[PDB]
A paper describes a structure:
Adenoviruses are clinically important, both as human pathogens and as platforms for therapeutic applications. Species D adenovirus type 26 (HAdV-D26) is both a cause of EKC and other diseases and a promising vaccine vector. Here, we demonstrate that HAdV-D26 uses sialic acid–bearing glycans as a primary entry receptor and that this interaction can form a productive infection. We solve the structure of HAdV-D26K in complex with sialic acid [N-acetylneuraminic acid (Neu5Ac)], revealing a similar topology to the known sialic acid–interacting HAdV-D37 fiber knob in the sialic acid–binding pocket, but highlight crucial mechanistic differences likely to enhance HAdV-D26 affinity for sialic acid compared to other types.
Numbering used by the authors:
A (entry chain A), B (entry chain A), C (entry chain A): 186 to 368
Write the structure that this text describes.
Amino acid sequence: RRTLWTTPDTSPNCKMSTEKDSKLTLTLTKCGSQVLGNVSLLAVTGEYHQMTATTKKDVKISLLFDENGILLPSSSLSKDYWNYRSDDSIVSQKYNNAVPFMPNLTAYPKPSAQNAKNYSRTKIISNVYLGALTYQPVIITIAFNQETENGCAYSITFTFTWQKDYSAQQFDVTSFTFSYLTQ
Amino acid sequence: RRTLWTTPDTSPNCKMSTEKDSKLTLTLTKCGSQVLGNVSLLAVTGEYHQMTATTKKDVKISLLFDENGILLPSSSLSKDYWNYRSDDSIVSQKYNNAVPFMPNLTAYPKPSAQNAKNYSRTKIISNVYLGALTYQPVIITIAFNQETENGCAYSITFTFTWQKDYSAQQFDVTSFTFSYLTQ
Amino acid sequence: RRTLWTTPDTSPNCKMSTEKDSKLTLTLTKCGSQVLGNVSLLAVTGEYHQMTATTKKDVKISLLFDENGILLPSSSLSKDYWNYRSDDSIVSQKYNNAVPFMPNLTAYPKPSAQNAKNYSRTKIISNVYLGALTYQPVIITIAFNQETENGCAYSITFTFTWQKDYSAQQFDVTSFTFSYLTQ
Ligand SMILES: N[C@@H](CCC(=O)O)C(=O)O
Ligand SMILES: N[C@@H](CCC(=O)O)C(=O)O
Ligand SMILES: N[C@@H](CCC(=O)O)C(=O)O
């Protein structure tokens, strides 16, 4: 099976501010030596559902994986909601190896004492758009294997950062396509 | 067969202003649960071939599909010009099911009375560049399943929108890569 | 075999200013009628390793290919460092046909006397980010089949161009994903 995903529904699965306040829509499709990824994020409740002038314009969604490529429970994304695809849902077996979906550790090494700043290639940076409004850019930073916490073997994080005042709006962004080299 | 396309030639196939004034180059390659898409647009004749100060800085190219995934004749793209790949041309059979290329209706639901504003994930927004000149951004908005007209089951639309004055120039943009979840 | 790459290590393989001053990380994965590509560039030594106020804010990395799809020795990328994937390295056979990885000559024709300016679809233009810092955009231009020198049959070039003063910094950019139609 060649896709890992959250499912495409809008049932909350993720933490932006508080637990299960948001829907991360994420699909990872294996394409040989790369995964083709597609991501977006919606705030369903809580502060990011109706932002204020003081809301933090920087949200990080962390997916931490063990050595089998299985999501760790300390991730921002709930495990209930994350598995191999089956129709528009997921497979019933909870604990399925997924090393071939993990980001390559040579391309994207964990940070170390060896070399201070890590390679910029460990990140993808671009813009997505809040509310699908062209005048409302939000910077998406995708980082590969740059987390060490909770004993993780691999990581994929999605950070959204912006400068303009989006108060009174619901955080919701356009979809973003990306790829990365696999283990 | 795993690619639907316009063919890569420059024979006009599309309407920007008037019928068959432009070449839409579009390739959809099936990659499991995603299509990998690649698009660009060129004006061959008519107003967008030599824009004026009053030309509309907003062009929408609509591909409408029936429940079989087959292009409807009311689309901006001519059907003559759109089919499964065979060499650098298309297959001879005109009417081939293509549901596995269609955008997923759970990820990208049609608009309804149920929920006012639709999910931003139904769109991709980025920049492409007019004339391949780095100082001439044009915003591309790709939208999935957001059309209802003509009884369509699915839709993919490409809107190009800009602010700067590109008068006297030919509309022609750099290629854009994207993906989406499939039915 | 469905991936051509540089390998994901940081051993210098490329010329920005002087020979083997930099690491081009490039992976081309065949996906039917498209290649899914992923690129980034790091300066390891020389001027781009510690830029000055006079360093040229325009670097072109040229991959030139023969009619078999094999890299020509006059390319910016060293051939030693470029082959079909095998684990995290490359296959031992040096000279492997790769026409199915080459950019389509109908979609991306070489430049000619026939039609002055070439089609903008021959290029992809976007931003990547120096040092993975969101305030440091660098424009990446990918061009397909636009070189004629050294008798090349095909070409893929990566040009990085910028305006801001990045003096004292090491040239290093975030990863960029793209696709193109294949021969
Ligand atoms: N890196 C994979 C093998 C290559 C791949 O599946 O992409 C593994 O370590 O299991
Ligand atoms: N959604 C497809 C099945 C899954 C796929 O082909 O991507 C169908 O409805 O026919
Ligand atoms: N263009 C290929 C055939 C199609 C493909 O492999 O993508 C060739 O000329 O050998």
